[PDB]
């Protein structure tokens, strides 16, 4: 469960990414593809170059989705309802992969905003990305 303080924490570190959703989003996927190359089987049709049009556009959608999630952090199931059906039912993404992308999001914030991602902030953000992952893996079958 996310406390009131976790929620303040997540909103505040999230605000640092506000103008950089495509940038940060693209970097996180680049990192997930390179550090966990098994994730590439889900994107057979992507150009896997650095700063590829396809990766920039998908990195934006991902982080735009995570941005609405933060803005509805009280009701994550409703905020991510359609996404959970896409990921679990239509794409059958193996639930281990959500841990990989969550770790890469955390790495992007640490690179770009090292002081802001203090230990207690790091704990809140990690709680929020587990919560989002749980909603996205909630609808298998």
């Amino acid at each position: 469960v996310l406390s009131m303080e976790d929620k303040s924490n997540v909103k505040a570190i999230w605000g640092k990414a506000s103008g950089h959703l495509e940038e940060y989003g693209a970097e996180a996927l680049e990192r997930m593809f390179c550090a966990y190359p098994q994730t590439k089987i889900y994107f057979p049709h992507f150009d896997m170059s650095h700063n590829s049009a396809q990766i920039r556009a998908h990195g934006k959608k991902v982080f735009s989705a995570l941005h609405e999630a933060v803005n509805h952090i009280d009701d994550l199931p409703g905020a991510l309802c359609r996404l959970s059906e896409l990921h679990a039912h239509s794409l059958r993404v193996d639930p281990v992969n959500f841990k990989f992308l969550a770790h890469c999001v955390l790495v992007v914030f640490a690179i770009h905003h090292p002081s802001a991602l203090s230990p207690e902030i790091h704990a809140s953000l990690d709680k929020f990305l587990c919560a989002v992952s749980a909603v996205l893996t909630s609808k298998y079958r």
């Binding site: 640490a110 690179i111 207690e120 790091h122």
Partner: protein, 146 residues
Amino acid sequence: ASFDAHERKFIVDLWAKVDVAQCGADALSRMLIVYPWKRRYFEHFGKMCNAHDILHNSKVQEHGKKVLASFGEAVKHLDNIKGHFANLSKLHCEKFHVDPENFKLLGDIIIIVLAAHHPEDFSVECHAAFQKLVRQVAAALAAEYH
């Protein structure tokens, strides 16, 4: 699998820049803040109720320096990670009774600490080299668990 020449060079060049005492204290502190059940394994270090207590615990800080210096010895034994860590693995299993799933969680925290102290150097390819290292070290610690 063996580290290639390029993997090796990323790893070896980053690690020469790392402050092992400060990153080790940082990594150990964050793991007890992010995953609070791990505190049970260290109930002999004392004050671990909140995150202020942890950040101010001298024994936690000290221990973090050793854990990272140990991990740092993988960098001189890239060809032999499982063999180098085999006794430690025993010690964790038998003496400290630590569930081997937790080694992967520390390894991720270490990636985050390195990323924050070395941002220009922690590129996409460098991060992939280090992720492979951390996966091998966590596997070598879990290996003598029988």
